[PDB]
Design an enzyme around this catalytic site. Structure first.
Site, short mmCIF file in Angstrom:
data_model
loop_
_atom_site.label_atom_id
_atom_site.label_comp_id
_atom_site.label_asym_id
_atom_site.label_seq_id
_atom_site.Cartn_x
_atom_site.Cartn_y
_atom_site.Cartn_z
N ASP A 15 -1.56 -15.10 -26.58
CA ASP A 15 -2.12 -14.40 -28.03
C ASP A 15 -3.74 -15.48 -28.37
O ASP A 15 -3.40 -16.23 -29.33
CB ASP A 15 -0.98 -14.56 -28.56
CG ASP A 15 -1.69 -13.79 -29.89
OD1 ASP A 15 -2.96 -13.33 -29.77
OD2 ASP A 15 -0.94 -13.73 -31.74
N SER B 261 -19.50 -6.37 -31.51
CA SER B 261 -20.01 -4.35 -30.86
C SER B 261 -21.28 -4.10 -31.22
O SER B 261 -21.05 -3.67 -32.65
CB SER B 261 -18.67 -3.89 -30.29
OG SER B 261 -18.91 -2.43 -29.45
#
EC number: 3.4.23.22
Length: 330
Positions: free
Chosen positions: A35, A199
């Site tokens: 994770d 992004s």
């Protein structure tokens, strides 16, 4: 040193991935959920409340000659999905894919929430976010990666998750045969303890690319792609019959649909998520309403590039003095 381990989807939907991890002496192999959105290595164990164990493999520290109780240490964690676990702490030898760390904090669960009990395939979590998120008290502990880093050939790990197929986590090296083209690296903020990056925008299907900054986290422990409501609405508007259902808890779409791809930007580069990756199947057994793999982050408080996004790429988690993230097509 290096390590290399295969990671395998837990079910037909790629809801999560498990990777075998050797703990203790002699080795006890547990299948852990790696994770990148948390920083605790915790396991089902011989200390876990018996009624809360249902098919998981447990770590038994009393059977490990290298286990030592970390005196006074406890831990307690709550995840984004509302699940939780807590317990005490041992140090022991932990190996992943041939890479060994001695003195790793292995957090032994005394209690786990129902979601963990109900999933027989996950024996615990191995956190790969920054150690500043580790929950051990009163002495915070380091992640497996943080402990291994100095010994690694290069201070990196990579995630290469498969679509409906096994993939690979590598530590200490970049497998140049595992991706196509070049790796594009992008800046990371560690301020919130996550692999947080921005992004450069998105496209829906064959549509034009929208240049827009989207701050989010690279999180292998989250199944879906969670993005701003504007972006998600633009995606689902291209699917006939798709709608946001408050009763179901997100966007659903007719199972008869063919989904468009979704592209996200990494600098000037582009990662394309095929439409099929965005299908999470019937909302309930036998239903013709299917659950979407792109959902709104509104009210999560953060955008999450989960498995839906990451499995479309070869992803480099660069833990150099100034961390960065790299993405390549594959």
């Amino acid at each position: 040193s290096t390590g290399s381990a295969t990671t395998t989807p837990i079910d037909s939907l790629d809801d999560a991935y498990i990777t075998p991890v050797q703990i203790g002496t002699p080795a006890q192999t547990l299948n852990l959920d790696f994770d990148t959105g948390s920083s605790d290595l915790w396991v089902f164990s011989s200390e876990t409340t018996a009624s809360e164990v249902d098919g998981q493999t447990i770590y038994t520290p009393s059977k490990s000659t290298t286990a030592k109780l970390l005196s006074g240490a406890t831990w307690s964690i709550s995840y984004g999905d509302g699940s939780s676990s807590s317990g005490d702490v041992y140090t022991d030898t932990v190996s992943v894919g041939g890479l060994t760390v001695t003195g790793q904090a292995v957090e032994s669960a005394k209690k786990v929430s129902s979601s963990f009990t109900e999933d027989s395939t996950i024996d615990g979590l191995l956190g790969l976010a920054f150690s500043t998120l580790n929950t051990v008290s009163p002495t915070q502990q380091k992640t497996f990666f943080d402990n291994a880093k100095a010994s690694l050939d290069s201070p990196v790990f990579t995630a290469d998750l498969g679509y409906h197929a096994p993939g690979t986590y590598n530590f200490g090296f970049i497998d140049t045969t595992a991706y196509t083209g070049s790796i594009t690296y992008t800046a990371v903020s560690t301020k919130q303890g996550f692999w947080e990056w921005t992004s450069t925008g998105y496209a829906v299907g064959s549509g034009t690319f929208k240049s827009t900054s989207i701050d989010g986290i690279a999180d292998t422990g989250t199944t879906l792609l969670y993005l701003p409501a504007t972006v998600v609405s633009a995606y689902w508007a291209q699917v006939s019959g798709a709608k946001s259902s408050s009763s179901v808890g997100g966007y659903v779409f007719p199972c008869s649909a063919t989904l468009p791809s979704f592209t996200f930007g990494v600098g000037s580069a582009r990662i394309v998520i095929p439409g099929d990756y965005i299908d999470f199947g019937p909302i309930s057994t036998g239903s013709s309403s299917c659950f979407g793999g792109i959902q709104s982050s509104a009210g999560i408080g953060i955008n999450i590039f989960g498995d839906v996004a990451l499995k479309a790429a070869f992803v480099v988690f660069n833990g150099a003095t100034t961390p960065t993230l790299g993405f390549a097509s594959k």
